[PDB]
Design an enzyme around this catalytic site. Sequence first.
Site, PDB file in Angstrom:
ATOM      1  N   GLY A  11      -7.300  11.704   7.952  1.00  0.00           N
ATOM      2  CA  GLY A  11      -8.113  10.609   7.187  1.00  0.00           C
ATOM      3  C   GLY A  11      -8.090  11.195   5.609  1.00  0.00           C
ATOM      4  O   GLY A  11      -7.911  10.263   4.794  1.00  0.00           O
ATOM      5  N   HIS A  67       0.828  -1.113   0.112  1.00  0.00           N
ATOM      6  CA  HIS A  67      -0.059  -0.149   0.010  1.00  0.00           C
ATOM      7  C   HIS A  67       0.850   1.308  -0.095  1.00  0.00           C
ATOM      8  O   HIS A  67       0.400   2.467   0.250  1.00  0.00           O
ATOM      9  CB  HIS A  67      -0.927  -0.122   1.254  1.00  0.00           C
ATOM     10  CG  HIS A  67      -1.625  -1.147   1.392  1.00  0.00           C
ATOM     11  ND1 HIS A  67      -1.266  -2.183   2.181  1.00  0.00           N
ATOM     12  CD2 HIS A  67      -2.882  -1.802   0.846  1.00  0.00           C
ATOM     13  CE1 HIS A  67      -2.300  -3.140   2.158  1.00  0.00           C
ATOM     14  NE2 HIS A  67      -3.157  -2.881   1.292  1.00  0.00           N
ATOM     15  N   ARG A 103      -2.429  11.334  15.218  1.00  0.00           N
ATOM     16  CA  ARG A 103      -3.381  11.434  14.262  1.00  0.00           C
ATOM     17  C   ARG A 103      -4.027  12.814  14.421  1.00  0.00           C
ATOM     18  O   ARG A 103      -4.102  13.131  15.702  1.00  0.00           O
ATOM     19  CB  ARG A 103      -4.530  10.491  14.697  1.00  0.00           C
ATOM     20  CG  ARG A 103      -5.760  10.599  13.895  1.00  0.00           C
ATOM     21  CD  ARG A 103      -7.014   9.501  14.037  1.00  0.00           C
ATOM     22  NE  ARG A 103      -8.299   9.914  14.104  1.00  0.00           N
ATOM     23  CZ  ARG A 103      -8.951  10.774  13.160  1.00  0.00           C
ATOM     24  NH1 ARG A 103      -8.366  11.288  11.901  1.00  0.00           N
ATOM     25  NH2 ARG A 103     -10.087  11.161  13.352  1.00  0.00           N
ATOM     26  N   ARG A 158      -2.944   4.432  -4.121  1.00  0.00           N
ATOM     27  CA  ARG A 158      -4.343   4.338  -3.850  1.00  0.00           C
ATOM     28  C   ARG A 158      -4.584   5.825  -3.696  1.00  0.00           C
ATOM     29  O   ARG A 158      -5.928   6.193  -2.959  1.00  0.00           O
ATOM     30  CB  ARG A 158      -4.728   3.562  -2.883  1.00  0.00           C
ATOM     31  CG  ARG A 158      -4.721   1.987  -3.057  1.00  0.00           C
ATOM     32  CD  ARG A 158      -4.715   1.219  -1.754  1.00  0.00           C
ATOM     33  NE  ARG A 158      -4.781  -0.340  -2.172  1.00  0.00           N
ATOM     34  CZ  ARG A 158      -5.819  -0.972  -2.331  1.00  0.00           C
ATOM     35  NH1 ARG A 158      -6.977  -0.424  -2.220  1.00  0.00           N
ATOM     36  NH2 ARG A 158      -5.835  -2.151  -2.786  1.00  0.00           N
ATOM     37  N   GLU A 204     -15.213   9.711  16.823  1.00  0.00           N
ATOM     38  CA  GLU A 204     -14.489   9.422  15.511  1.00  0.00           C
ATOM     39  C   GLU A 204     -14.475   8.068  15.074  1.00  0.00           C
ATOM     40  O   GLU A 204     -15.141   7.285  15.486  1.00  0.00           O
ATOM     41  CB  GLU A 204     -13.154  10.434  15.467  1.00  0.00           C
ATOM     42  CG  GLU A 204     -12.215  10.044  16.794  1.00  0.00           C
ATOM     43  CD  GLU A 204     -11.511   8.820  16.485  1.00  0.00           C
ATOM     44  OE1 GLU A 204     -10.700   8.672  15.421  1.00  0.00           O
ATOM     45  OE2 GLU A 204     -11.597   8.112  17.472  1.00  0.00           O
ATOM     46  N   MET A 205     -13.427   8.089  14.043  1.00  0.00           N
ATOM     47  CA  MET A 205     -13.465   6.446  13.506  1.00  0.00           C
ATOM     48  C   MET A 205     -12.135   5.415  13.272  1.00  0.00           C
ATOM     49  O   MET A 205     -12.153   4.497  12.981  1.00  0.00           O
ATOM     50  CB  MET A 205     -14.032   6.520  12.119  1.00  0.00           C
ATOM     51  CG  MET A 205     -15.469   7.084  11.957  1.00  0.00           C
ATOM     52  SD  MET A 205     -16.110   6.849  10.437  1.00  0.00           S
ATOM     53  CE  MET A 205     -16.414   5.201  10.212  1.00  0.00           C
ATOM     54  N   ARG A 236      -5.688  16.762   2.650  1.00  0.00           N
ATOM     55  CA  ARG A 236      -5.291  17.445   3.798  1.00  0.00           C
ATOM     56  C   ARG A 236      -4.023  17.106   4.238  1.00  0.00           C
ATOM     57  O   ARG A 236      -3.444  17.952   4.544  1.00  0.00           O
ATOM     58  CB  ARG A 236      -6.267  17.150   4.862  1.00  0.00           C
ATOM     59  CG  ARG A 236      -5.857  18.230   6.387  1.00  0.00           C
ATOM     60  CD  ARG A 236      -7.027  18.423   7.217  1.00  0.00           C
ATOM     61  NE  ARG A 236      -8.316  19.191   6.183  1.00  0.00           N
ATOM     62  CZ  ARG A 236      -8.468  20.594   5.985  1.00  0.00           C
ATOM     63  NH1 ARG A 236      -7.495  21.423   6.550  1.00  0.00           N
ATOM     64  NH2 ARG A 236      -9.590  20.804   5.475  1.00  0.00           N
ATOM     65  N   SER A 264     -16.244  19.263  14.879  1.00  0.00           N
ATOM     66  CA  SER A 264     -17.140  19.960  13.672  1.00  0.00           C
ATOM     67  C   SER A 264     -18.404  20.133  13.981  1.00  0.00           C
ATOM     68  O   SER A 264     -19.202  20.864  13.268  1.00  0.00           O
ATOM     69  CB  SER A 264     -16.566  19.098  12.513  1.00  0.00           C
ATOM     70  OG  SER A 264     -15.302  19.142  11.890  1.00  0.00           O
ATOM     71  N   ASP A 265     -19.100  18.979  14.831  1.00  0.00           N
ATOM     72  CA  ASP A 265     -20.465  18.690  15.091  1.00  0.00           C
ATOM     73  C   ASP A 265     -20.511  18.471  16.408  1.00  0.00           C
ATOM     74  O   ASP A 265     -20.065  17.774  16.911  1.00  0.00           O
ATOM     75  CB  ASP A 265     -21.064  17.962  14.090  1.00  0.00           C
ATOM     76  CG  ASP A 265     -20.884  18.246  12.639  1.00  0.00           C
ATOM     77  OD1 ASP A 265     -21.821  18.826  12.034  1.00  0.00           O
ATOM     78  OD2 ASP A 265     -19.903  17.457  11.842  1.00  0.00           O
TER      79      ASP A 265
END
Length: 239
Positions: free
Chosen positions: A24, A8, A91, A47, A183-184, A28, A207-208
Site C-alpha cells: 500500500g 496514473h 500483494r 501521484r 485488510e482492504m 515501503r 499488526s493488530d
Amino acid sequence: HHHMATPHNSAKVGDFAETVLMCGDPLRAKLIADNYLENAKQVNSVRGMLGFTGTYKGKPLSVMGHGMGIPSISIYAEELYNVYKVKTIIRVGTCGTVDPNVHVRDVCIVTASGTDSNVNRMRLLGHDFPATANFEVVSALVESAKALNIPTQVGKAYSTDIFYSKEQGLNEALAQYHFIAVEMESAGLFPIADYYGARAGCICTVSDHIITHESATPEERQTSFQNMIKIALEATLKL
C-alpha cells in the site's frame, strides 16, 4: 513533460518486470527496492505512487505502491496487467485478525478474500464471485516459508472498504468462519488477474488483533516485515 502510457503511471511499456510485488505504502516500495533489489531504477512517480524495477537474485522483479482500498489497487493492477503485460502480482501487506488462533506477528498467506465491495458482483451478473488467489502463487509462498523455517497461517482474508468499521456483528462472523486476515485490497486484485489470464496472490503480517486489542510495536513490525518480504522474494524465484 513525458508521454504517459497510462493516466496514473509514467513508466514506459516494458519498464515493469513480469513479476511485481505491491504494497500500500509507496515509501515501503522504495524501502523494498533499496534493500532487496539490484539493478534498481525508479520507473514511476505519478501521484507519489513510487514504483521500481530491478532484479532479485538475478531475476527481473518490480515493486510498486498500490494505495489504500479496492478502487486504488484496481487502477494500478488493471494497468500493470493490461498495458505493462505483467504476469504475476503478489500483494505484500499488513492486516488485522479476529481469529482466536491467529496472533500478532503471524504471517498470513491468502487463498481467497471476501469483501463488502460491489466490484465482484458487478463482474458476475450480481452473483458471488470468489476473489481467489492463484494456486501456484499460494504454493510458492507456502514452500518459500517452509524453506526459510517461518511459520505461516494459510486461509481466507476479508477486504473491507471501511477502515473505521461501525458494523455490529462483523467481527464475530469473521471469527466464526475462520477468516485469518482483515485488510482492504486483495479482493479487488484477484478478479483482475483472472480477467487478464494472469496470476495473483497476497501475503500479510498481523499488526493488530481486533478482538484482544494486542498490537505490534514498531520494532516488531520491522521484524515481521523482514520475514514476510523474504518469503515473497524467494517465492518470485519459483514464479
